[PDB]
Design a protein around this ligand. Sequence first.
Ligand SMILES: *C(=N)[C@H](C[C@@H]1CCNC1=O)NC(=O)[C@H](CC1CC1)NC(=O)c1cc2c(OC)cccc2[nH]1
Ligand SMILES: *C(=N)[C@H](C[C@@H]1CCNC1=O)NC(=O)[C@H](CC1CC1)NC(=O)c1cc2c(OC)cccc2[nH]1
Ligand code: NA
Lengths: 304, 301
Amino acid sequence: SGFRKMAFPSGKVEGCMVQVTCGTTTLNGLWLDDVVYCPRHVICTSEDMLNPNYEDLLIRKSNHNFLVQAGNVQLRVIGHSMQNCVLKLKVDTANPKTPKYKFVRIQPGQTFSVLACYNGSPSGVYQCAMRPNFTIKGSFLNGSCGSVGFNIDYDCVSFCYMHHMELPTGVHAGTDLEGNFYGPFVDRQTAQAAGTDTTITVNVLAWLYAAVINGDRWFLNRFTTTLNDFNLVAMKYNYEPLTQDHVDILGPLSAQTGIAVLDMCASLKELLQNGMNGRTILGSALLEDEFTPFDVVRQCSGVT
Amino acid sequence: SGFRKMAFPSGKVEGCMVQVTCGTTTLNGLWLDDVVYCPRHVICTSEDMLNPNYEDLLIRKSNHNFLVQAGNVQLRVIGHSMQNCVLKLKVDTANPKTPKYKFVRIQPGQTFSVLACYNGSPSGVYQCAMRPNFTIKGSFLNGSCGSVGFNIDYDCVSFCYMHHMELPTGVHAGTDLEGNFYGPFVDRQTAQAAGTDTTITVNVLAWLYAAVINGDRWFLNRFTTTLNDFNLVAMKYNYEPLTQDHVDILGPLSAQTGIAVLDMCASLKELLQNGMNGRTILGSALLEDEFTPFDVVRQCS
Ligand SMILES: *C(=N)[C@H](C[C@@H]1CCNC1=O)NC(=O)[C@H](CC1CC1)NC(=O)c1cc2c(OC)cccc2[nH]1
Ligand SMILES: *C(=N)[C@H](C[C@@H]1CCNC1=O)NC(=O)[C@H](CC1CC1)NC(=O)c1cc2c(OC)cccc2[nH]1
Ligand code: NA
């Protein structure tokens, strides 16, 4: 037992982190097969960052302008291209540590592990959630761009995030592995504001199911509600609306505890309208929203 | 910026996890060089677990009773011995993925990363602290015994923990890699209670410095306290006392933020006496004590 914010084992991703340098700018890249993926602003200097014309800047670069390094070992760049905000550098060596992998674009509310790297060296790993406003409350410093977030299913690594930016409020922004930003953010040296954040409702429900599994069930009530009425109230309490996918992935926890999704939604609606009244859930007095139903299933059943 | 519970990258440890089976019991082992380390209760049956005479049980086993598996590859056991609660199985193959490593015993208040594994397959990694009562607030299920905790210094892995047991309260217990339990716990199948736990004060102070570095400073005040008066109040609230060494290691964070240590201690004393008033610090409604000063420095610099 015990419930912890848990990250995936990072070895498979560690085996793929490299160091990409253009001129004096050094950030991190992802070496899969014979291709290295990294943020394109590696080709920028400071004066270019303020308003960059990445096409014009890339036409001026050649293969021999890119220094790719695994450790201190150079990988020769034999091709280069730009896909949205991601630079793809074809190298001369296929990574022998390439795992089975996919590129996926996650939805707001999903979690993933971030491998914080600097100069191609992994420094840390932590668990993160894509907020409803398409930011992440990560932990990044200078030189962390190109660090990736990922999940692992069986032995297959699904890469979903590449880091690019820190907003003035201290949250972070990035793209998928196809270079498309999450949210309305652009890779420019500008102070950009995110929309107002909200609470991830499906994750709070997953946490309440985790409570019921461990005996904590004072918050259950008689009532049920329709999905639409619940979403209407939830938006009034700065909670995200619940999608059909959300109801579907809550299915296993509903079957394990015997509590239907809409019944638990009525329980949470009562919690939002009346409060907690001093009482606690899993010790905590705050409702936790960065555990997905998958995370609860993973820690309350064991997976891989 | 930002602050998260961060674990060390686990790849070097993943390269060493194997599956150890004796009879019907299967748990995890650590394969370093030509030796596999695992919890000794792998040799016990449900009958033995109540009051196991481990040396009698071990002398009755042979090399061929132990099935060591690296993924889908059998490792032939050519020796076996016992160091306290840890069984050491000598195999015929040296692990090529063996990193530079050390066996260390950590003190209460220190943190480490846990690689939770089942049947030799790593499933998760998270950050833990050795509680003052020598438990850890981990996340372990059946078959997780043999999972290890560790830190990493440049490229050297310091193994400090091997998991053995879950207490009735849901906290966890284990040994160092020399087989000596942390705390008054025993590897037998009984309900075992821990001593009263206290809060790691120096860690709370480091985490308040982390909160100041990341903008949160509603809890600060214009007051200052002496070390002894702060320790009086802290012990009143079941907090471990703050030593001069603790004050010194907070030095870098004090220099970075410009807040003296005793100034922050006045802030924390006000927090303990008054409460949070519904407010939060770094998204937490409770005072966090599982970040050492070094963890904060490493993350905020
Ligand atoms: C990549 N190495 C780096 C990582 C940042 C720095 C601190 N922690 C992080 O997460 N990324 C950047 O520095 C990016 C680069 C631009 C292409 C996006 N810039 C920012 O994150 C950035 C720039 C500003 C700014 O510029 C005037 C004003 C306010 C905030 C801000 N953030
Ligand atoms: C190892 N695979 C396993 C890991 C446990 C199971 C549940 N989660 C964990 O962390 N360890 C055990 O099962 C140990 C074995 C000990 C003999 C060394 N046993 C316990 O943790 C245990 C036994 C009891 C008990 O027995 C009557 C009563 C209450 C609690 C308890 N915990
Ligand atoms: Na003060």
